[PDB]
Paper text:
The multidrug transporter P-glycoprotein (Pgp)/ABCB1/MDR1 plays an important role in multidrug resistance (MDR) and detoxification owing to its ability to efflux an unusually large and chemically diverse set of substrates. P-glycoprotein (Pgp), a member of the ATP-binding cassette (ABC) superfamily, is one of the most promiscuous drug transporters in nature and is capable of binding and expelling a very large number of substrates from the cell. The structures highlight a high concentration of aromatic residues in the transmembrane α-helices that form the DBP, many of which are directly engaged in contacts with ligands. The binding mode of the environmental pollutant BDE-100 in the DBP of Pgp was also previously captured by XRC and it was shown to be a potent inhibitor of verapamil-stimulated ATPase activity of the transporter.
Surprisingly, the F724A mutant structure had no detectable binding in site 1 but exhibited a novel site shifted 11 Å from site 1. A close inspection shows that the Phe979 side chain in the other structures appears to be just outside van der Waals contact distance with the ligand (not shown), and therefore it does not appear to contribute much to the binding energy. Surprisingly, the F724A mutant exhibited no detectable BDE-100 occupancy in site 1, but revealed a novel site 3 that was shifted ∼11 Å from site 1 and was located directly on the axis of pseudosymmetry of the DBP formed by residues Met68, Phe71, Phe332, Phe728, Tyr949, Phe974 and Val978 [Fig. 1(c)]. The F724A mutation resulted in a greater shift of binding of a single ligand molecule in site 3 that lies directly on the pseudosymmetric axis of the transporter. Site 3 overlaps in 3D space with sites 1A and site 2 in the other structures, and there does not appear to be sufficient space to accommodate more than one ligand in the F724A structure. The novel site 3 binding site in the F724A mutant refined to a considerably lower occupancy of ∼0.4 compared with the occupancy of site 1 in the C952A control, Y303A, Y306A and F979A mutants. Phe724 and Phe728 (both on TM7) appear to be important for maintaining the integrity of the canonical BDE-100 site 1, since the mutation of either residue resulted in ligand shifts away from this site. We conclude that Phe974 undergoes an induced fit-like disorder-to-order transition to support the binding of BDE-100 in sites 2 and 3, and this residue is therefore important for polyspecific recognition of the BDE-100 ligand when the primary binding site (site 1) is challenged by mutagenesis. All structures were determined in the 3.98–4.17 Å resolution range and adopted the same inward-facing conformation as wild-type Pgp.
Author numbering: 30 to 626, 689 to 1273
Write the structure that this text describes.
Amino acid sequence: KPAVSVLTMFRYAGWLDRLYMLVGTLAAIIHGVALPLMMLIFGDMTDSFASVGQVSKQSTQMSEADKRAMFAKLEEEMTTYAYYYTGIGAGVLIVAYIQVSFWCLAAGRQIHKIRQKFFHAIMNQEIGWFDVHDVGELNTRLTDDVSKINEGIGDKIGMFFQAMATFFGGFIIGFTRGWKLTLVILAISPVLGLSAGIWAKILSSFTDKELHAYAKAGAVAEEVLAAIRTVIAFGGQKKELERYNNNLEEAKRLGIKKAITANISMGAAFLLIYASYALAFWYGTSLVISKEYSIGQVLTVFFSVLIGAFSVGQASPNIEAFANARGAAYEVFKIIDNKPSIDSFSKSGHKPDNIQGNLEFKNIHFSYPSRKEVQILKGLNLKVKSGQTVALVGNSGCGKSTTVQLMQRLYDPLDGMVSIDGQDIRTINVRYLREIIGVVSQEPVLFATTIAENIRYGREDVTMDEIEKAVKEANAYDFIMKLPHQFDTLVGERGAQLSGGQKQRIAIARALVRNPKILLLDEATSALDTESEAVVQAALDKAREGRTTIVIAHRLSTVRNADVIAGFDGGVIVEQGNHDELMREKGIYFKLVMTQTPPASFWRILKLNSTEWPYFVVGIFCAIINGGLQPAASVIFSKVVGVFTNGGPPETQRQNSNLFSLLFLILGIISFITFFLQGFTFGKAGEILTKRLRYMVFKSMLRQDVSWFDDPKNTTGALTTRLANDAAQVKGATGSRLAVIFQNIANLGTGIIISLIYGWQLTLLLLAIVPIIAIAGVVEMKMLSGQALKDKKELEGSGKIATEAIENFRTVVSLTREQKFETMYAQSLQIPYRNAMKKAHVFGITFSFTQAMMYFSYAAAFRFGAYLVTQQLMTFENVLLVFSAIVFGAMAVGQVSSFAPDYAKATVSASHIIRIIEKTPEIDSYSTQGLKPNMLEGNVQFSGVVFNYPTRPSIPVLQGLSLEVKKGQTLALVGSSGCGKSTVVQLLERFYDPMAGSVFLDGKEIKQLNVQWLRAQLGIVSQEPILFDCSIAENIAYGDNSRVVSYEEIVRAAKEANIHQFIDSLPDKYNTRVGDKGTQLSGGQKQRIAIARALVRQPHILLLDEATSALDTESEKVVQEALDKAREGRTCIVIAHRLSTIQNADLIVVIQNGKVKEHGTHQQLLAQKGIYFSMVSVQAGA
Ligand SMILES: Brc1ccc(Oc2c(Br)cc(Br)cc2Br)c(Br)c1
């Protein structure tokens, strides 16, 4: 919404840049004017053949006489015109170079200036300016927005004035050579803009419907794939498939309805568009039979107007490119023009010599850019004498740290003054102020250069002698010399990550080369290892006694030798003096001392599409007809101008022109009929395999075991995304692109035959010319992508040192040396700048070449069409036909290159969708194999079970585990922590087979047992019961599948689970909808319902996995009251974390490190004293 003045945007254009744009926009207009003139001469050549075409047929008496005056007219005329086109092609060769080159030159020259000015402005901003913005957005603003500015001021402007030249020059020749047809062509323009407007309404409305249509099926898939361990547990894998299949049926029916309406839309759209043209051209014929215009002029105005009319649409993108470049330049120039109060690049203020270093703070009130929300200093008074070292202590707020911020004049105070020596700090130069102040901060930062270079960021003029003394005087010498490469080592976020105390001494040595008169040490010893602390602390004490120093730290070890100590309380200075005095004061300081002591040939996807042997053959056959039907309009247009250039006697002409125009409209309605079919046939054929694919995928997905859905590569969202994209992409490959690619090869094929059999030696010429300009048009775009990628590679090296500069900013400004990054960024941009200059000559040559190879090509189309061919017996009416036929047949092949990525994007999406079906699990629930035992009673053997989760085969959970529980008993299971309690339930449910050992139930190994039958006698109840969006009657009936459960049977379960209090209380009762879609209710109810569906199954084994996990107060007392009633009649395994409710259990088992450690009844394990009795006495007292 915000934008920029048009002159301010080019503020960096001066002298030559202003000329480049003037000469560029001049030749751009000349380039645009050239095309409607190119068509103007196309009318005069018709009149040349027309005068001869009328007189040649008018004879029917003399033949040799027509070999004289006729050919004489032709050679003087045709050579005059052919001489003119060759001049036009030489003209466009020059102006197209001038157009693109100069604008890209002015762009590159300015964008170099933008960059430098804009990075200059970033470094000039005071700190308070950064505290209110994000530096990451700013850096992306540096590389992206400057690119948008370059796109707007570039060669797009020349293309704009080129298009307006074609537009103006278009209707000028349109108006002057005839004012009627133009008003007639503009009269049909609202109809064309109205038919395309029906598309903006149908698309935007129907694209939402399908995104709502599958959103109903994708919603089913998401609550399933999220609740997968529950559907696997109860074996609803046939229902959840069935229910996803039922939504696919509706999405198919909505997809075929969209296919019907959208194809009616296209066909009716074109048929209105092509009828609009034909009426404007038929009523061009109605004006020639009346002797107002010539057959050549009708062509001249008919093309020049449509060229200029379409030139409007070809200029619209360049308008938006210029407008976005303006809007992008607002926030950029806003930074450049913004002037700070502090600068730090300003050459102003005093520069005192012989600085003794007497500092005082007077009545300083201050607040960080959070402003009126918080005021961190409520007045202040503090002096520090020259040579002394004051220490600042404080409990919180870190107002200690604020004084270091103010001393560097990072911010100015609200009220008060900070005074170095006697002068106010605001009188001294900002840069010289920071050169007389050395800073060592908590987190040391080192730039991505050598050790010497980081030390060289203290002062630019320095020799390895002074680096050596600095690191040796900050005892960091002995510790780099052992490190290889000497001073020439590397440091940064990338490579040679060092010790913190090691990085701090390099910072101290960096601050030591600064030979400052003032020293600020903030938290430097804090957040650092204890032993290297003393090593750095020796350097700090050696960094002083030649300087006055303010130090802030939470280490009360460094503070004793400070000449004076100062404490803060609420921004107010309170205590000050020597250590002994503050201890006698017994205040804040004393109080803190005591406290701290694969693209491949995939045919099978089409073999699955072979389910419909018809529907393609209908569409293919119907597409090839539409392909062969499409040049016939060019054949008609050829003969409409042909027989009426080849007229002769004029009485018969008016009667044939009506016959052809009638044929055209019968030929368009039969084109509507054949294109309503080819779209419907593939549309239906695509929507039906969309179901088959999504059906078979969602079927195969429910087939893998829990080992596959635990994969971090496979989550619920990534699976629904993989489910939706892969099915829609393969639909597009077999969809419109294939009908169109066969329509177009039939378009050119039926066009090449007519042209080849109409023009001898002629078609063979064009087939030598057209492929060259097409390949020359492709090699340009490859060179375009190469130059684009290369410039991206070498400007990110500039933005990389700009990234280091701006998000490490508060350190560099503390070290000054902004001019250093200022220059480094300039040297980095000098390569893309001198590269951007070559870009202009490259784009200019390539563009001018492809334009000349088009004009020169069409000079050879006529010079050969006339002369050698027309001195022979071949005719003009066919030359016009071969042009339209070949040129449209080629431009229809241009759609093949546009649909190319739709194939690769689908094959890659197909690549995954064939793999996802064929992948088979280790534990397949679909296998009908298995024993299906007949005996009822239930035991459970775990014997020497060692288990590791397939996702994390590092720390074992089960190793040598052994259990046994009799029928009708409750097996309590206690653990120190982890899923060692829960993995038992997962292995009995056979979510996994164990690595070693085995688990049995009725004496039979479950590994050889039926997987589905096994899970059918299991009453799993988890800690967060997931309930699908449906009637609670079904959420309860979900516990028994392969059969519909009675109402009074799901009532009995609701009676058991003690949930029946709601189930009558609701207005809907058992038919209420739950799932946070129709109704919401708390967890205790969700849980009871899970108990209800658990014992609908009438299991012989309950599995209670921390059922009272998320639950509170009386809700625990009633759910336990339901669980305690559910067991005791069944085999039970309960791992609930309430050991008070576990006391009444037939056998309690303590799990240690995967091994069974301690088992027995409650009082038996309570008589023993160990883990269980520690587990029961850790929560009874707490
Ligand atoms: Br119908 C018909 C279509 C294209 C024809 O030649 C061209 C060609 Br070839 C290129 C361009 Br741009 C414009 C025209 Br008009 C002719 Br002549 C007749």
